[PDB]
């Protein structure tokens, strides 16, 4: 599990696997978010740049922070 | 009845029961905050993302922190 | 009066009585900071939501800690 | 030795052009007359709003730039 | 005397320290007086003045000596 080398398709699959994100995943792909970009995102970006609501933004960022661990 | 598995509606009722929060509850719901998101909130998010003032934000976060114990 | 049960109006008066804070008290009232919120404040909160500089923020927080003991 | 603050529009062009997927985005940096000084002031939102760059690339480009500032 | 220092007493004290001649203007920009200076902590310097931990540590150490 090295998210640092994930592709845009890998990130889409990852986001799509998260509860309630089947649709939000297309926004990650539309913004060409790959593994490198994924690890740099913060709630701010998710809300400002991708119109994601605060609840999902935080739960997604919590799932991202868990990846940053092995 | 464990906040970590609360729904958006559960969080709405919880915030709604709080002094001065009957409208602010609608903002939690519009933001789809469930138990898992509620427990990750910090004062800064309430003020920035939901435009809540610092006094209510402090008191809400305090009510949230008492849940975690 | 114990600070924990102070109203927004009480907090205004307290901050307003402090050297250099006559205007800063208006920001406290605008933020609907009552006693409960006042005692939960930290310097970062003062610097963030109220643009207060660290020098006064440290002094306002010390004056606040003076209340809590 | 390097000093990004005194880079010209051409220097910045070459730098962005060396970045993965940016051979084309570099022409927009030049069209916007971004020199070293401007380069160091850029943020993701500027890149998205002013240059039509998507968030994933904007994030990665700003990260490479932040590496310069060090 | 340090407890009764002015915002100027501080600028003057900080300016005296290695590498601290310029960041001394920050203390006046944040209006740090004696009582503020003596209640200041490392995390505060990192947050409010963008200072890195090494310098924040050394600056606070010089301040704690005053006491």
């Amino acid at each position: 599990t090295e998210p640092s080398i994930w592709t845009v398709d890998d990130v889409w699959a990852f986001i799509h696997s998260l509860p309630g994100c089947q649709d939000i995943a297309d926004e990650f792909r539309a913004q060409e978010i790959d593994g490198q970009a994924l690890l740099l995102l913060k709630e701010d970006h998710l809300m400002s740049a991708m119109n994601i609501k605060l609840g999902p933004a935080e739960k997604i960022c919590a799932r991202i922070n868990s990846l940053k661990e092995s």
Side-chain angles (χ1 to χ4, degrees), chain A:
Chain A
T1 323
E2 255 288 322
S4 166
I5 60 102
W6 283 0
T7 61
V8 159
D9 277 342
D10 292 330
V11 166
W12 182 92
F14 171 74
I15 297 293
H16 179 262
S17 69
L18 296 188
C21 295
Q22 298 84 19
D23 205 306
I24 282 165
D26 295 330
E27 187 62 23
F28 276 65
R29 172 183 266 156
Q31 292 292 351
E32 288 177 21
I33 296 175
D34 56 351
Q36 187 182 336
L38 184 76
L39 297 181
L40 275 65
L41 289 173
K42 330 162 159 153
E43 307 90 89
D44 276 355
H45 292 124
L46 288 193
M47 299 191 268
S48 48
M50 297 194 261
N51 198 34
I52 297 173
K53 288 169 177 308
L54 174 64
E58 280 181 331
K59 290 186 274 165
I60 294 170
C61 288
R63 290 303 295 274
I64 288 180
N65 287 351
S66 291
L67 289 189
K68 293 186 189 193
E69 305 320 359
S70 271

